[PDB]
């Protein structure tokens, strides 16, 4: 055999590809020699005679992804109350499998997809993980994903790997769109996250002044803001680092500044240098 | 710099070496690749043993006949503790016979 256009059937070669692509996307073990052989099979399908079976290969690949992410969506619906950890466990496998599948479909990417509405295979899989996994679970996932970060502020220990992976997964789906590479993050999670943090830093922040005076409050202002800084490094994408901190201080300082400036007359005359640096950093 | 194809039976090491470097460094490269002792390695430059003392430049390899485009082949043999072995470099293949178009036929 040679790298020449030959008349090849699609059923046998596509079943041989179907086995290994089922292996890849679930991060199973597939033989390295078989992995190298399937590159030649992809080439043979892409330049087949008398018609290039590249469009058919892309169509059946998208059909396989339809049968795959929908099955994972059903499976993660079965595991109620465990949807977050199951979603992260399936998402890590699907992300690495989609990367390896982009590697396997490199000839289809360069010679058919980027030459002929058509998306690259590793980014078609990510867009499909959007529109069949997280879009059906849009309000469902945020229901308890926003709870765990709320629980962490309430004195709990949510899973660092599970929470960070799911929140970063919205960014990772946006990897291929060069236009708005953070629109999904800032329209599915970040906007619900910003309002929920504001509610937690308006209702609970007002509770600080209920039993504690201003001198105790200023120590507690730095307590929650720096604790928010620590949890920002953990559960948040770095592009959203600055705006959440500005929003959090807006809803518990910029709505209480009239009390701070009125008290600022007392700190000036008494020369309370201990809380002087508190006004300097804010 | 000198570029070589260290061929033994079917393996073909596409390595490079300095023109002033000696055969010992090349055998150490083969140590780093095929994990074999240099004492079990006899290198042939077209049916001619290379002594370990001499350099690549002296025995015939230069930067003009062993360019990166067409590196010069060198043989390799393994001892297996029994009087070494003869050179058994297997030629790659025959390209398809493309006849001269102006040949009378």
């Amino acid at each position: 055999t040679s790298l020449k256009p030959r008349v090849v059937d699609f059923d046998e070669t596509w079943n041989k590809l179907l086995t290994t692509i089922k292996a890849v996307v679930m991060l199973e073990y597939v033989e390295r020699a078989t992995w190298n052989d399937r590159f030649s099979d992809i080439y043979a399908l892409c330049v087949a005679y008398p018609e290039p079976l590249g469009e058919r290969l892309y169509t059946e690949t998208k059909i396989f992804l339809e049968n795959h992410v929908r099955h994972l969506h059903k499976r993660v619906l079965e595991s109620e109350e465990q949807v977050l950890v199951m979603y992260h466990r399936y998402w890590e496998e699907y992300s690495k499998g989609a990367d390896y599948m982009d590697c396997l479909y490199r000839y289809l990417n360069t010679q058919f997809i980027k030459k002929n509405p058509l998306m690259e295979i590793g980014e078609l899989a990510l867009d499909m993980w959007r529109k069949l996994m997280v879009e059906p679970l849009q309000a469902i996932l945020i229901r308890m994903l926003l709870r765990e970060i709320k629980n962490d502020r309430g004195g709990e220990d949510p899973n660092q790997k599970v929470i960070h992976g799911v929140i970063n997964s919205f960014v990772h789906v946006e990897q291929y769109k060069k236009k708005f590479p953070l629109k999904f993050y800032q329209e599915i999670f970040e906007s619900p996250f910003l309002t929920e943090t504001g509610e937690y830093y308006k209702q609970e922040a007002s509770n600080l002044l209920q039993e504690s005076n201003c001198s105790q409050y200023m120590e507690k202002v730095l307590g929650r803001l720096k604790d928010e800084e620590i949890r920002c490094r953990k559960y948040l994408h770095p592009s959203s680092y600055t705006k959440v901190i500005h929003e959090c201080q807006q809803r518990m300082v910029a709505d209480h500044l009239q009390f701070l400036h009125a008290e600022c007359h007392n700190i000036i005359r008494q020369e309370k240098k201990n809380d002087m640096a508190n006004m300097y950093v804010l | 710099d000198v570029f070589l194809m260290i061929r033994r039976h079917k393996t073909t090491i596409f390595t490079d070496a300095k023109e002033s470097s000696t055969v010992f460094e090349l055998k150490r490269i083969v140590e780093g690749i095929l994990k074999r002792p240099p004492d079990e390695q006899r290198l042939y430059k077209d049916d001619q043993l290379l002594d370990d003392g001499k350099t690549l430049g002296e025995c015939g390899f230069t930067s003009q006949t062993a360019r990166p485009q067409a590196p010069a082949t060198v043989g390799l043999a393994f001892r297996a503790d029994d009087t070494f072995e003869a050179l058994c470099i297997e030629p790659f293949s025959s390209p398809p016979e493309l006849p001269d178009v102006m040949k009378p036929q």
Partner: protein
Amino acid sequence: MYVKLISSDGHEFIVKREHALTSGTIKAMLSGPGQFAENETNEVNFREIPSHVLSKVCMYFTYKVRYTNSSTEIPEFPIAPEIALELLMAANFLDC
């Protein structure tokens, strides 16, 4: 640091890994399940690429890696007319 580009005939072509990633396809074949080979040098089976043309592919790897961003004038790759068609399809499949 070395990969073993095994051809269809059986001739293993142990070339440096940095040379092999000149071709995008070999880089893809060395990524994922292809990098899981624990036996040091990775074997990259090429059952569609004959040995006489994979040898020229490896020569091109060692040629382009050494002659990259060269300040002086660069010579063309010596390619035989009787191997040119087979090495054209080998260059497409390897994307080098």
